[PDB]
Scaffold this active site. Structure first.
Site, PDB file in Angstrom:
ATOM      1  CB  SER A 105      61.512 -31.971  -7.005  1.00  0.00           C
ATOM      2  OG  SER A 105      60.999 -33.152  -7.644  1.00  0.00           O
ATOM      3  CE1 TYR A 129      58.078 -34.329 -14.722  1.00  0.00           C
ATOM      4  CE2 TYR A 129      58.416 -34.523 -12.406  1.00  0.00           C
ATOM      5  CZ  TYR A 129      58.866 -34.639 -13.717  1.00  0.00           C
ATOM      6  OH  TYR A 129      60.195 -34.968 -13.883  1.00  0.00           O
ATOM      7  CB  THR A 155      59.013 -31.103 -16.139  1.00  0.00           C
ATOM      8  OG1 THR A 155      59.745 -30.414 -15.117  1.00  0.00           O
ATOM      9  CG2 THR A 155      59.912 -32.116 -16.845  1.00  0.00           C
ATOM     10  CE  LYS A 218      63.861 -29.033 -14.776  1.00  0.00           C
ATOM     11  NZ  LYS A 218      63.830 -30.445 -15.100  1.00  0.00           N
ATOM     12  CG  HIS A 242      64.498 -34.789 -17.020  1.00  0.00           C
ATOM     13  ND1 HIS A 242      63.147 -34.508 -17.068  1.00  0.00           N
ATOM     14  CD2 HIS A 242      64.714 -35.426 -15.842  1.00  0.00           C
ATOM     15  CE1 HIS A 242      62.594 -34.933 -15.927  1.00  0.00           C
ATOM     16  NE2 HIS A 242      63.512 -35.517 -15.182  1.00  0.00           N
TER      17      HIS A 242
END
Ligand SMILES: Cc1cc2nc3c(=O)[nH]c(=O)nc-3n(C[C@H](O)[C@H](O)[C@H](O)COP(=O)(O)O)c2cc1C
Length: 344
Positions: A105, A129, A155, A218, A242
């Site tokens: 992450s 991100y 993402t 993603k 998600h």
């Protein structure tokens, strides 16, 4: 005690503080997609072949050219140290033991560097991100590259954070001794301040010029979007809602998987996450064309039980259920897991 993934969730509910369990468990709004990510798997039925010779079942496969021991990998889940003290470090150590990959992450409670040092031999990828601060964004990519992460999973479904009702009720935030180590609902406000709601396909072009690492989009749920990702030179699609935490009322990922596999025409690998709890789930996803699947919540429950060992146990349960499902279906290896195994 714990012999399947549901048992690990039940154990976690019994030992985590309510706000932490709820953060990990929740979906958005009324949680319709959260239930469907699981229910949808059950609607896909299996048509096993008999008498195939399954003495030797080989679960290994490849993700973006890198070998893995099984088509079951760890998805990005933020802030793992809420479930257990060792957080991401443990996860990575378990992945190294199993021979599978870990997607880290961007909102980890351990740094890109701390996780790589804990799992040098593990296959590791960075979930990214696109932050409002493109210098923040670039130095995450550069840190991944230098540290032998093997892909970027960008993402694309989070311009804003979904509305998870329990986080709003609990006023979710991190426990005081923790931080995101790479830099109402506390997290929704953080997103609003930090994460760029303006990103477009032009930003994907930017990211595709920025790094030579493979990039996977993603959060795609439409075939047209998947075809756009392929046009932009991306190297895979992670079909994802998600964990049902963003827009509620989207379909289950296993239901949209075939449209996405059809849309990309074999040009890039297609992956799935959302609702994977059982070896038969993995088998169904591979029969519909996914190369591998990612697990989110089961990993957190493995941490909540027993840290590194508990993540190892969850992964080993999935591996063994998958082995059994392959054998009972007549499949010696992943290359023979075909579309006729399933029907809805
Ligand atoms: C607690 C939690 C934290 C998450 N954090 C992230 C994240 O930091 N980045 C991200 O791209 N996706 C995040 N996700 C989404 C997961 O990567 C993944 O898409 C989802 O967990 C898959 O479904 P599953 O939990 O049913 O396995 C998170 C999901 C959960 C449950």
């Amino acid at each position: 005690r714990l012999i399947c993934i549901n048992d690990y969730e039940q154990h976690a509910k019994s030992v985590l503080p309510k706000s932490i369990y709820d953060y990990y468990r929740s979906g958005a709004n009324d949680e319709e997609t959260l239930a469907d990510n699981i229910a949808a798997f059950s609607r896909w039925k299996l048509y096993p072949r008999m008498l195939r010779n399954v003495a030797e079942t080989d679960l290994s496969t490849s993700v973006l050219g890198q070998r893995v021991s099984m088509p079951i990998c760890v998805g990005a889940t933020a802030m793992q140290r809420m479930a257990h003290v060792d957080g991401e470090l443990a996860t990575v150590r378990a992945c190294q033991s199993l021979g599978t990959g870990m997607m880290l992450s961007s909102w980890a409670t351990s740094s890109i560097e701390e996780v790589a040092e804990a799992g040098p031999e593990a296959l590791r990828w960075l979930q990214l991100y696109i932050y409002k601060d493109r210098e923040v964004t670039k130095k995450l990519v550069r840190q991944a590259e230098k540290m032998g992460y093997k892909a970027i999973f960008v993402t694309v479904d989070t311009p804003y954070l979904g509305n998870r009702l329990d986080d709003v009720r609990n006023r979710f935030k991190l426990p005081p001794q923790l931080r995101m180590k790479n830099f109402d609902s506390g997290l929704a406000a953080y997103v609003a301040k930090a994460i760029d709601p303006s990103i477009s396909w032009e930003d994907i072009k930017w990211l595709r010029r920025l790094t030579s690492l493979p990039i996977v989009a993603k959060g795609i749920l439409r075939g047209d979007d998947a075809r756009e990702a392929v046009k932009h030179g991306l190297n895979g699609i992670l079909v994802s809602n998600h964990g049902a935490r963003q827009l509620d009322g989207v379909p289950a990922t296993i239901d949209v998987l075939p449209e996405i596999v059809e849309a990309v025409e074999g040009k890039v690998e297609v992956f799935l996450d959302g609702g994977v709890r059982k070896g038969t789930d993995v088998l169904k996803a591979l029969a519909l064309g996914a190369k591998a699947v990612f697990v989110g919540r089961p990993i957190v429950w493995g941490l909540a039980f027993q840290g590194e060992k508990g993540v190892q146990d969850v992964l080993e349960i999935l591996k063994e259920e998958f082995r059994l499902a392959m054998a009972l279906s007549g499949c010696q290896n992943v290359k023979v897991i075909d579309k006729t195994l399933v029907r809805k």
